[PDB]
């Protein structure tokens, strides 16, 4: 994707760039259409992750996790 308009100013001290947004054309669009081991295996295959992420952790790790973390924005 490349379409912007650059222009050095008259005295040549600032660079003015102009860049409107490219809107998606209507013609480029589609219409809207209208156990325990096996559980880890099924979740791993459905989310494309390893099995190791799905086994639980002990109580020591469950307690250090911050329960009201600082939230920004």
């Amino acid at each position: 994707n490349c379409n912007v308009e650059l222009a050095l100013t008259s005295d040549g001290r600032t660079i003015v760039c102009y860049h409107p947004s490219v809107d998606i054309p209507y013609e480029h669009t589609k219409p809207i259409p209208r156990e325990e081991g096996p559980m880890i295996e099924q979740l791993s295959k459905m989310f494309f992750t390893t099995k190791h992420r799905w086994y639980p952790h002990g109580r020591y790790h469950r307690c250090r996790k911050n329960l009201n973390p600082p939230k920004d924005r």
């Binding site: 994707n1 947004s21 054309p25 013609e27 480029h28 600082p70 920004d72 924005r73």
Partner: protein
């Protein structure tokens, strides 16, 4: 260290600079001792400087007690309810004066680690990046290897 200490994101108290700056310190509670030696600088501060400090910023209300509960100490109370209890034990007059001026100039938020040196509510004005910002569209929007 920082992995043992808590942390917070940088913020103001109540949007303190948009419309008007409001003095975020609410009270100061000096508790000097009359016949004392650790409160020598405290008595110097009370005799010399607390009048000028109380006139310099009238948004704070300053209580001075004699024969304290514990030692010469200052108890700064802020608008968000936070209470900072500093001790002026065995401090001279100028150290007490600059500590009080420090207490007047800060907000009640904790002095724990601040995660970012900046905090923007609306960080993107042209629209935050998603993987389709710079990909071009296709004839009727067909993904690769589609027959029709």
């Amino acid at each position: 260290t920082a992995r043992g200490t808590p942390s917070r994101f940088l913020a103001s108290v109540l949007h303190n600079g948009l419309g008007r700056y409001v003095q975020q310190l609410q009270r100061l509670s000096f508790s000097v001792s009359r016949d004392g030696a650790s409160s020598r600088g405290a008595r110097e501060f009370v005799e010399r400087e607390v009048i000028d400090f109380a006139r310099r910023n009238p948004g704070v209300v300053i209580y001075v007690n004699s024969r304290p509960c514990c030692v010469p100490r200052v108890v700064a109370e802020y608008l968000n309810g936070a209470v900072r209890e500093e001790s002026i034990h065995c401090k001279s007059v100028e150290e007490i004066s600059t500590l009080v001026q420090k207490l007047a100039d800060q907000s009640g938020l904790d002095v724990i680690r601040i995660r970012k040196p900046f905090h923007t509510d609306n960080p993107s004005i042209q629209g935050q990046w998603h993987p389709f910002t710079n990909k071009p569209t296709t004839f009727r929007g067909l993904r690769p290897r589609e027959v029709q």
